[PDB]
Amino acid sequence: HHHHMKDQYLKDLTVHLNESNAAPANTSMAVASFNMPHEITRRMRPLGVDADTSLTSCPSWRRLQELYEIHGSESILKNFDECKDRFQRYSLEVDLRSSDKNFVFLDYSKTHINDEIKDVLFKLVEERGIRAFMRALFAGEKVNTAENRSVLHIALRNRSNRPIFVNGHDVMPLVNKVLEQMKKLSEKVRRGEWKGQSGKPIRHVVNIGIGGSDLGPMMACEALRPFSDRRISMHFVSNIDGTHLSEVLNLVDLESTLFIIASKTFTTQETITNALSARNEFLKFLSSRGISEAGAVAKHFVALSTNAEKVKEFGIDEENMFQFWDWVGGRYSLWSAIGLSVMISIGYDNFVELLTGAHIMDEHFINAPTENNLPIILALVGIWYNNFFGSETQAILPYDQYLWRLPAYLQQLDMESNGKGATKNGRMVSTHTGPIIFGEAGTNGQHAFYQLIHQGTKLIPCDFIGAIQTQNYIGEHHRILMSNFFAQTEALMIGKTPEEVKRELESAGGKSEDEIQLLIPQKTFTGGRPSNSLLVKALTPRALGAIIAMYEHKVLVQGAIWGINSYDQWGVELGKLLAKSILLQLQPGQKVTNHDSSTNGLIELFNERSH
Amino acid sequence: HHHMKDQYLKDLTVHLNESNAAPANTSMAVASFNMPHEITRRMRPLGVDADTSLTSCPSWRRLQELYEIHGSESILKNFDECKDRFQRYSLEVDLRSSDKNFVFLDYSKTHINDEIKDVLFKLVEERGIRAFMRALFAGEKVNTAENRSVLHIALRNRSNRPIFVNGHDVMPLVNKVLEQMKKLSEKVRRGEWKGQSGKPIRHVVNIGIGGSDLGPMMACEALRPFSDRRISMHFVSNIDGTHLSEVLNLVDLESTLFIIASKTFTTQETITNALSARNEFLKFLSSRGISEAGAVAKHFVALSTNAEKVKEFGIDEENMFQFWDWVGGRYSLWSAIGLSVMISIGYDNFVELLTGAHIMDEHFINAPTENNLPIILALVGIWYNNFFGSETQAILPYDQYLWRLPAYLQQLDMESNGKGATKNGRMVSTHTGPIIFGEAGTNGQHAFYQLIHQGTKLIPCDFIGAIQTQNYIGEHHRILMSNFFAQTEALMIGKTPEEVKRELESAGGKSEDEIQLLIPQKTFTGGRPSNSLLVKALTPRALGAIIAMYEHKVLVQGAIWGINSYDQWGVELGKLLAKSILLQLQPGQKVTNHDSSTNGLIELFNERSH
Ligand SMILES: O=P(O)(O)OC[C@H]1O[C@H](O)[C@H](O)[C@@H](O)[C@@H]1O
């Protein structure tokens, strides 16, 4: 069989090269495009199932491959030189319908995409039935087939309150009931009516949770600090590393601290262990102060969860349990009860603004025609680079210091959703799926790793994200900030030729002919490196809501095109299972022989030196 | 240009006729053959000939052959075939300390057998790496593009053996500044340094960016258990006015010491932040009825190479802490730039930090290649970067104090080796530095490990941990480290379709159809690599050793690829273009001279900025 596959591989390669439209200098590009699905299916071979051909055999996919072989080595500037108003034709704006005339604007023009490639990318949406999938997901159909679940984070922010049905019942009444419950608690805390066991108003909130129950609340509290009540300090314990709880406990006055235990399952080992430790340390502190423990936990601990039974066991009153539902994915849970810490920080009205921004982006996504659909366009630009240029990564570069946790947040949203190797129809993928997300807030990144983005050997798609207006007016800081935002994307695209560099070196003087000759390529910029520029008028709660929903929907479109399930996360189960067994073996002086020699050796090293 | 196509097809034909790849793996041979062609196509705009000095190395060609033969094997294959693989594929550097600390590397969970390992070591010989190392350590001007020495190792040279630059021993210079740092840090820590109204310093605000920011902040976070909690440390870096504004709101300005950290003292973000901080500080004193006479001299110090600009800012000569051109910014934690660290953790702990790097330096320069920890890290990285073709490198510290280590290594690695041209003026024919990413464990497990386990990219991972915690509570550290060991095991061994099926069938509650569809979605390929790095405890000495180890890994990789790890020309174009655009950011101003995107974006900003 293997010999037959080889003879076939060679036949397919010969045919592909004979039929390719690639320029004579670019034959290697046709080979790379041909070879991509072969290399993916080799790497995924231990899945032990057939390769999915449903995407790669789409007429549009064949056409995109042909267009890549033709255009993939062209500059980006070429398209601008050919169309003087390319910017107007390769950008679009979503109105946020707010009193401050806010918006989300996408400029996707600094890309290797011409009108033909763009038409064919839109045709891929049609051929893969993406618009019908979107309608099914929005209507509550159980599109998370692996877990037989609906996918309805959009219900959480459904301000229209049109019914959305799960198991024959409208979910909106319960969504709105929990929002009202959240409102009442946040109001009591913000107004100083919620008192601790010794009568102190709450001045500290400590969220305990991990992953989806941590990244969102923290990112949003950071992002929306200008809209917050500064009298209430927000803390986020997440690592099981004892350092995390210990350092946060050191920062708070426990008599005025509200603990929020955030866990969809309420069984995650890190979160439940942190919660039990926090409760133990809290009660011990009270006892040391001669303060009665009777009724203290009920005043100082609340829970955000789907599991009432587990919350009860912990000792939290059901009245202080904030419910959400199985159709709320953890990495999509900011909008739900999980956002309670956020609502305490910025207030109910601002939380509703946050929901409303997401809702407006939802309405745009579901209703706008494909050609004018901002999240679909984001998704297609991403696929062009991810699947045809073969870029492994995606940089997220927000030029707003409050947004410094956005890259980490989008890391979970994107990579945990679409880091998949098997399709919903039980096959292995033949195309690349989710990319690796990385990034830091600008301008800091410019002084850390943009060197590589400009001059290295990898093509890195970059999303530059900014606000036209600052919340903190000081000197010329915001103008300087945004001069960098605009300049970096210009620089990535246009580069700097050897001829330009040579002239500059000669004009600077002080160097020999040979010295200049060595130096020229080292100071040359290829250019032709792509970016998207995303702008809002101002980073308000509404704008942040729109931005996050925008990426949720980008991820939806990409997953659906690739044929994978964006909404499960099976890949975390093996590690949890293996860690349970190892934990039992972490005892001083215990010898271990049942694993591979590395795992055995590492555990024994730990067991021999741990004290 | 059809002659190039003809030749390409001939070369590919010959490569396939001679390849020893298994029948099922022809695509792997094609991928290997095609890699330099794709690199040189992508770097074509550099307009110079391709470097073949690396690809022509006999060891490079042999590694290519071994990749085509062994590249699709599981990782477990080599464990099954050698019962003590762990012993042969691990090593430890002794940190010579009273607490018996160490740096231990386990590189066994890799696609590397004895034959590949030997050939990787031969590559070190063939690229003259050991000789390069000696030249660099000796102060030779190996940063050829800038005609500079590269001597961050002199900064922590506790032995005080002479090291010469322009025929002069730099060690007396290094030691004088350390003593200067000692004196200031002691005055601050002892409450002797008073502000303009007589208050002891309780807040330190470092203003700096990149190399003048990431190291100091990373180290102050990493070494918090060894710090003076009476002194709050703050790090302003972004020009975004939010950064300075929020920090100013957290401090009492009457007891704040500002530290302006900038090698050039001309970086736009840092000098603008420093001028604004100076302004707000003086407005604050005035609002409190406090005299401004001599106030800047009392509250501002500088870490720099530029004495004139420091003088111009108003800082006294006694409070300028010098370092030197041969200290790269991303290698500068060990110099005057580390002043905020020394204030926070004290002179003695800062000396421990230097000592740890020094011991790693001694190991690096003296240990044989086969037992050289940074060289092995570099070689493992090159195997994946250049032969498997992985674009990234994950850095996963299982220590909450190390939460800024990935961002710090992002600069160290990517700004060093994110290069496309060689020192001899050619374009590279091989991939250079990978993209660094990561978050402290266990948090990353609940964020993005899903993709590391089940996605379509191979991602080399460095797992870094401490055997002992500084914060004993309950069973937290045992739980933390059970995850540390389990994740690397999981990545390697995966979970077969038969295992998955058995589990699903025992659990029940699903139709046959549901189970059939679910099995592939819950299968793990395994064969995904990792390094496990351990220290006994994350002390200042251990941190020093860890950073020095990565500095030297970067040195070795850069030297093998023939690039300059120590310059950074790639940041210049953006700075020039931003100064130009800044001139055009005025309300209502129309802009026509750029590309239509840059024009439109700027006009959008100018139309709606008010
Ligand atoms: O210390 P400075 O001279 O202010 O430079 C700070 C940083 O700015 C530059 O842009 C470089 O990217 C970094 O290598 C450097 O560390």
Ligand SMILES: O=P(O)(O)OC[C@H]1O[C@H](O)[C@H](O)[C@@H](O)[C@@H]1O
């Ligand atoms: O909210 P929890 O049930 O505690 O789960 C928190 C997190 O842990 C899991 O391992 C997943 O990786 C995440 O999808 C999830 O958000």
